[PDB]
Symmetry: D2
């Protein structure tokens, strides 16, 4: 019995390398994928939007849209989902973020919105944010050195809250090096991603997460990746 | 105005390389160090224990003992502090741990007891324990590889709680490597300590922490390093 | 003036993810790519091999074949190149390696044969082999720990020659950790590859290398990646 | 049969933390240590230098001096050894280096002079220098990032010779990170030392090395750590 069993997604972003990875991952999970898309699959022109989508959501009431698109399209693509009344999971970056949440909360529609869908990265982030809030000053006097490439903005925000001083594509690489005042203690965290699979699997995870909240007819309609993580592994 | 200003410690362990590091660190903090010790400083024979110590604690009511000693001496050295009524900070390992806490709670005496006093290591531990409890399963399917040398037992306990599979001297070294199922994501944590300075500074930290709880006449008498970390930097 | 300027390759392996990366890299270098292939490009059936290829090599005398194929095809695909008399660069693994060199040396034909074409990896290898031969025993008594994933067989051969004790897809990851006897010294080497671009660029490098040896009418006909590295950067 | 068996050293630097580590290491190797010293052991005033030392070197013809001292004392302490005619191993930094070699080559006296005595560090250096000279340009276009603390000047000299772009106490730490142009390949070297034991053991190694060259009545009188490494492990 697959866990995606009984769930359908529409993947608006079918051509992007991200969209593909999502398709691959959803297919593994047993999530069925409807063969229509927007701006094997039949892609659709950017007119007649409501009617194509309303009639899919009518034919597939278990449908959840996945949106991985363009910052200019966010506020537009969200105004569409809310008028049709279909839940969605959106990891796209950009747009009037305040207007985008406004749109969805007036619609009382169900959604997961997180510009970052690598759920393992989020967890490490959240730990280092809990640590910074629970144990203020614990690393007072330590220095931080960073190497990166082409997210780490919160990480430095935490280490400052912890008392430290400091000055989607293929690969990503992050290295953070904590040194003690007398330089006799070093901590080092290092992070390598090759591909977008980690983001796919987290998108699928939000999907499965969000199907459950719909089914349970939950009162909160809008969720983030931390919400997803707290539910536990649904796989 | 130093923060150790107004605080005195007796360092039972004056000859151990640890004891020295504590002395060095306490001296930096402005903590005054009484020149008597047990089993520059005048070391004392293991008889007449109560009287030597009672008359120091009478002469120095702001005294806090620091104990870094032998596992066989723990339950004995604690029964002494409680009869004199002097607060202590004990990082020694071993002994009947249940009998040792029993001894101190009957005395209603003030103490910090943590076999691990590198407070930065504790914080990382606590983050990874919060993460494991808040986000069950977040790393389901990841494999863990470990390299070590001559603590990491909880770390593997967490990563199992997070869904992962797996098979005091001079230096210490720990490396932990998390790999994703498709092996396209890696996290790596690495940890090097050279010396005992990190433990000294944390012992001093518990001391300053514990002076405050005494002064404030706090109701809880027995604390651990997590308690110390939650107070914030006192330096 | 591109450095691939004036050079043509045929890429037998046009469909493999490796073959693609080679095409991408050769295109950057200015290497022209003929649109025929074997077992945009027109792929050809596995019969009439000599005639198709003889007439390309007649039409394109500056042609160099690149072969990234199947171990069963090595000894066969090499017997073809030698009868036509066309230089090739082959990174495929497998086959009767002794029979494969026999085939080419009787033909007195020009070739680069290296199952490993990431030239940067080869260099590190060669350094650690020079070190092992020049400085026998230099790491006598050090221990070696290794983490890997899905090459490192020589690396351990070296470190044994240096006195140490020990027990093509998307990503690759290698970590090697040298620890001193008293465990107060650690060296750590770490190696991450995401993609096949590094192998492409080295294949192209052998190509440019081999065009020069042909042009200069050099007496040695068969080369490896070390030969390529000693020539210097040709880019 | 210890390998230091039959060899005696005088350790001018008996009080420095380095000198101690050397003593510890020489004692392990079976090297006998004479109980006189300069500027258990009896330390000597800085006058009557020649006579004290001439009469030790007369009483102990197998003596080899080890010098770990002050830059101002180098040129002076070397002029002393040469007039007495006693071999020495000197890792001290500073002084007129040209005048210091001049002094020793006129004396035709036997010596090892290397400001760096961690022989394992030297080996890695020499490999990366062989690599830079044998394979010019091999890392053309790679970027280099460096983290350090309180040597690496040659390392960057090599990586520039390899085509890369770039902008004695307790602990030491070095991390070097090589990234490919498309950022899909990373190499990382990392280096941690805690203590001076690694330098001691290399000093002892030069000593044993130098006893052999004396015994064999070798024609070259002045050696470096590379010479020591090429002999092989003498332990």
């Amino acid at each position: 019995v697959l866990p995606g069993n009984g769930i359908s997604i529409m993947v608006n972003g079918c051509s992007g390398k991200m969209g593909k990875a999502v398709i691959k991952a959803a297919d593994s999970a047993g999530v069925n994928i409807v063969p229509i898309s927007f701006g094997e699959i039949t892609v659709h022109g950017p007119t007649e939007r409501e009617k194509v989508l309303s009639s899919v959501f009518e034919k597939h009431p278990e449908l959840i849209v996945v949106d991985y698109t363009i910052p200019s399209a966010v506020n537009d693509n969200a105004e569409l989902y809310s008028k049709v009344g279909v839940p969605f999971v959106m990891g796209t970056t950009g747009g009037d973020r305040n207007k985008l949440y406004e749109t969805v909360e007036e619609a009382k529609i169900y959604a997961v919105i997180s510009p970052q869908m690598g759920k393992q990265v989020v967890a490490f982030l959240a730990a280092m944010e809990i640590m910074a809030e629970q144990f203020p000053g614990a690393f007072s006097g330590y220095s931080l050195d960073v190497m990166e490439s082409h997210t780490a903005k919160a990480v430095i925000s935490c280490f400052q809250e912890l008392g430290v001083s400091y000055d989607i594509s293929g690969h990503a690489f992050h290295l953070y090096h904590l040194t003690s005042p007398d330089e006799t203690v070093s901590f080092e965290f290092q992070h390598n991603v090759c591909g977008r699979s980690i983001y796919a699997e987290g998108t699928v995870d939000a999907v499965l997460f969000l199907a459950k909240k719909i089914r349970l007819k939950a009162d909160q309609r809008i969720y983030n990746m931390i919400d997803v993580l707290r539910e536990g592994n649904m796989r």
